[PDB]
Amino acid sequence: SVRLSGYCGSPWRVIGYHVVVWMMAGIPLLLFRWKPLWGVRLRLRPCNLAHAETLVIEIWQLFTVQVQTEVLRYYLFQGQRYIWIETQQAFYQVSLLDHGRSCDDVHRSRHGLSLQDQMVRKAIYGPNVISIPVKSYPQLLVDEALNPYYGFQAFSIALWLADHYYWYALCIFLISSISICLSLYKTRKQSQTLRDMVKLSMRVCVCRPGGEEEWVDSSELVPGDCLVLPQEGGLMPCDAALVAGECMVNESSLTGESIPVLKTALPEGLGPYCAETHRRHTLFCGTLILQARAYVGPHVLAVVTRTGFCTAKGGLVSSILHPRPINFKFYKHSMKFVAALSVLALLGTIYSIFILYRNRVPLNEIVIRALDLVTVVVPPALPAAMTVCTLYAQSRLRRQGIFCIHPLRINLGGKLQLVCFNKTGTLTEDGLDVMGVVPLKGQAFLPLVPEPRRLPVGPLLRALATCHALSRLQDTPVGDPMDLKMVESTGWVLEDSAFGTQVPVPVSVLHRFPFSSALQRMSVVVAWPGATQPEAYVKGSPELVAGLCNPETVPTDFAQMLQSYTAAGYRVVALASKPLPTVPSLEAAQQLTRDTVEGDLSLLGLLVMRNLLKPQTTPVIQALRRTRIRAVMVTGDNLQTAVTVARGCGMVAPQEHLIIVHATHPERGQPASLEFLPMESRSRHLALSGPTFGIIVKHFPKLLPKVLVQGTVFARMAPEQKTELVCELQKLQYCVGMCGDGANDCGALKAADVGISLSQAEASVVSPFTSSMASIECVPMVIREGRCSLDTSFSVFKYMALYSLTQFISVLILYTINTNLGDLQFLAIDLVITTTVAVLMSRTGPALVLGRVRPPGALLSVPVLSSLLLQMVLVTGVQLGGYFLTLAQPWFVPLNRTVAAPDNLPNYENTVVFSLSSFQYLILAAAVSKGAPFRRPLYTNVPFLVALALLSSVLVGLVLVPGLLQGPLALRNITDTGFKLLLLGLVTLNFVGAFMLESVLDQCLPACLRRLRPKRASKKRFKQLERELAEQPWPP
Ligand SMILES: CC(C)CCC[C@@H](C)[C@H]1CC[C@H]2[C@@H]3CC=C4C[C@@H](OC(=O)CCC(=O)O)CC[C@]4(C)[C@H]3CC[C@]12C
Ligand SMILES: CC(C)CCC[C@@H](C)[C@H]1CC[C@H]2[C@@H]3CC=C4C[C@@H](OC(=O)CCC(=O)O)CC[C@]4(C)[C@H]3CC[C@]12C
Ligand SMILES: Nc1ncnc2c1ncn2[C@@H]1O[C@H](COP(=O)(O)OP(=O)(O)OP(=O)(O)O)[C@@H](O)[C@H]1O
Ligand SMILES: [Mg+2]
């Protein structure tokens, strides 16, 4: 639902808002950007929608859009135009302006659009361009800079400049600059990814009225304008309708199919034009026109129907630009985690105030010091660390061949519990092998014919020859693999279509009804010289096409004979025919409606084909099943063929049980029923058809959750039915992945949490995830990358918490003794060590093999907080032990407490505290960076390992080498080598203790947590169902 509110302009209110929010504080700006309804209300007054100059859009969220005026006044929301329809006093989308008009109207527009009426609907519809905003760098820098995080960083820069910490202020500025530039690079890269995809700049003829032509730019086209498509072919600038001609288009860019598609001129009728019904007669935007030819007239004519964001390509671009929110929250209780850190910081700030008071510090100094301590806990490198983590994940995927348009989905990749796969072309090979055709003699089958060439000239041979949709493109037949191989098997050659016998008269296709996956069949009307009347041949599902056949034609053993082949893994389609008494002419043949042709058929035979598993499918499915990720086959193919393939690829193990859930439609006077008939060979799977799925959904809502929870093979599913299944699975708190192929899986790929397409270009719009490899091996790759990304994000958050608390503790320890950490020492710690390490941790790749344990979903967990608390206990212990150890030495000299820092540097206390803490930052970085299960070992990250080794060597030189970096850093020289070695020993103790603490926690905390308090249940609805089925299996 949506709602609109109009806000008429007024200067007094605007200036009042400006002065109030500028003089008062930045807090009102913060709450306005958090609650912008108040901001808009205060800025301007509600007004009648007719005069509104600004609107607020809810869907409940509010987006403020200005109302452009040209009078024609409109507005753009998410790239979609809405104009002011004066008569109705409302804003209607321009997508609906001509919605529902007739095909005869398109054929009338055929003549062209007069230039006086062209500019009108250019204004209403706007330019024909899917325009992605290209921005000046200042605009970006403003967009990131106005982040409140960078506002606090600038406040810190000013605060530390006010205290004469120039190097630390420069350090903060440089780190924030790095973060901002990384964000700019990220946004710029995504924007170019979109723009390069939506590029279009070309000149296209327009059939201007009066019989003349004109070369206008592609962006001057408007719906109702007439195109002249080139004969040699070219890209399509906008959605259109063919009014005259024939076109061979490659719609791979829009839908991912590399098989050429034929487009025919639009029929004439008093029915509503549509891009779904007349998809065959309509060209799309961004699809390539391989070749065009005009049946009648000098040139091929098309009439534009949608432009800009109205087009299907525009809709996909809009969905990419403005994606639906990711419901899953990767980091549970993040606000409470940062609050648990902030409470510790606040207790430390109270301690700081108390001690600074106890040392008789001036009040202004006390407040400045407390503000400094508050700024210490906010790390300037956190945004850079997060951005770099995401960038590294994306780069790793890209190197593996996987492209993601929404990088936020990479983390969902590691959340997957269920992956749905389409069978043909995803699990099994694209190519077929015609194993033979089973003919019929009366009402009985005949032995399979391995070579359909040997068939006698008759209805079955001609049905095989000419029941398809193939087009010779560059002297090579192209089209469906099934059609290609089935025609190849007969020996007839292609040349509205005519076929020459192998060596028996040429056969002509009068009319052809294309294959629709909803119908799962196609048909032709065919005549040959010497033919009494045309004949129609229907090819489609053996089950479905047999229903169209006359009962006396279909043999009594039809189902058993079909199962003989499909249960052996073969793809089978039935061929049926019927004589059409119509005169054998193109005009009369085209008169027939599809429904009349499809029914009352006579079965001719079964075409048996052999599609084999990809060799990469069984390993991947066994790997997924090994890690308790559900593999589900969602296919439009036979149930027996699909079940055989599922057993073959390991979706159903040899020792596991499979039950065929069969639902019967509720006949007259009786209710619907379910039959469960097991078939001979977690451990119990269900296999069911599309009709059964629909019956169970409509009539058995109570049993549907169980069918979904233990259903593995979903056969004979229509595309919308695959989408419905994915949505139903997601209703059970499943994170559903979908590995799809073509138009039959686009809805499921959109609905799925992770949708993957296999044989794709470098950058594609088909699905959120696209890959270049043909196999489904990209699925484990995506899951592994998502798990690595979750683990890396958790490790980076842990390191930033640990680094902050460590700096906080050291600065508190130094405040307690009336000194500080020195200026170039802040610069060193924050820039050289910590930023380097934090931006290098996240470059280590995923583990090579998936595992049964999933990454944690909550930052605020007992393991995480126990780890941080014990790590900080050890850090504080080491620092305070070093401090109380330097006091016991004989050469020690207490600092000049009278003058506060930085006046009293160098001193021994600061020297020791800085050395220990500077080692502890590296120690903590190495500790948080873990390997198995979700990541590779630390030492496989050469930049990170080298940074650790180099920084450790530099710090050891600082501690040992006399006079090294002591002037700059303000370090007190310590001659005693025994104390230096004892400091290094304490550092080694800290390292060993940190690593052993992490190992002990990881190994023994989950078990103690389980024993102490077992989980009563799981909120995952599907896990509740899984357990409930465990006590009582549903099918008895
Ligand atoms: C005073 C010195 C010690 C400052 C230390 C800071 C560096 C460790 C940081 C600052 C920003 C970091 C850079 C942030 C951005 C990235 C991008 C990253 O590559 C990608 O993310 C995508 C690559 C592609 O598109 O193919 C390579 C590392 C790099 C340059 C990082 C390398 C390490 C850098 C230079
Ligand atoms: C007083 C002096 C002697 C001490 C100062 C030492 C630092 C300036 C050195 C020590 C380790 C060095 C870092 C060691 C490793 C790297 C990784 C390098 O980035 C990459 O290699 C990414 C390559 C890719 O991913 O393609 C950027 C430089 C950097 C941060 C170096 C920057 C300078 C550092 C921080
Ligand atoms: N060119 C064609 N002519 C006639 N019938 C066809 C043709 N192509 C497919 N069929 C039949 O229609 C059905 C549709 O299955 P199809 O594979 O197109 O659906 P799908 O959902 O894409 O399946 P998958 O997920 O396995 O790709 C098949 O069972 C097949 O028997
Ligand atoms: Mg398919």
Curated annotation (Swiss-Prot):
Mutation effect (T426I): In SPG78; no effect on protein stability; loss of autophosphorylation; loss of lysosomal location; loss of ATPase activity
PROSITE patterns named among the record's database cross-references: ATPASE_E1_E2 (PS00154)
Magnesium in keyword set: yes
Record topological domains on the Lumenal side: 163-165, 358-372, 815-820, 879-911, 965-980
Glycosylation sites: N896, N973
EC number: 7.6.2.-
CDD domains: P-type_ATPase_cation
Predominant location: membrane
InterPro entries associated with the record: ATPase_P-typ_cyto_dom_N, ATPase_P-typ_P_site, ATPase_P-typ_TM_dom_sf, ATPase_P-typ_transduc_dom_A_sf, HAD-like_sf, HAD_sf, P-type_TPase_V, P5A-ATPase_N
GO biological process assignments: autophagosome organization; autophagosome-lysosome fusion; autophagy; cellular response to manganese ion; cellular response to oxidative stress; cellular response to zinc ion; extracellular exosome biogenesis; intracellular calcium ion homeostasis
UniProt modification remark: Autophosphorylated. Accumulates in an inactive autophosphorylated state and autophosphorylation is stimulated by phosphatidic acid and phosphatidylinositol 3,5-bisphosphate but not by Mn(2+) or Zn(2+). The presence of spermine results in a dose-dependent reduction in autophosphorylation.
Gene3D superfamilies linked: Calcium-transporting ATPase, cytoplasmic domain N (3.40.1110.10), Calcium-transporting ATPase, cytoplasmic transduction domain A (2.70.150.10), Calcium-transporting ATPase, transmembrane domain (1.20.1110.10), HAD superfamily/HAD-like (3.40.50.1000)
Effect of D830N: Reduced spermine-induced ATPase activity
Impact when changing G413R: In KRS; decreased protein stability; increased degradation by proteasome; novel location to endoplasmic reticulum; loss of lysosomal membrane location; impaired autophagosome-lysosome fusion; impaired degradation of protein aggregates
Subunit architecture: Interacts with MYCBP2; the interaction inhibits the ubiquitination of TSC2 by MYCBP2. Interacts with HDAC6; the interaction results in recruitment of HDAC6 to lysosomes to promote CTTN deacetylation.
Comment block on domains: The N-terminal region is required for targeting to late endosomes/lysosomes. It does not traverse the membrane but contains a membrane-embedded intramembrane domain and interacts with the lipids phosphatidic acid (PA) and phosphatidylinositol 3,5-bisphosphate (PI(3,5)P2). PA and PI(3,5)P2 are required for the protective effect against mitochondrial stress.
The protein's name in its UniProt record: Polyamine-transporting ATPase 13A2
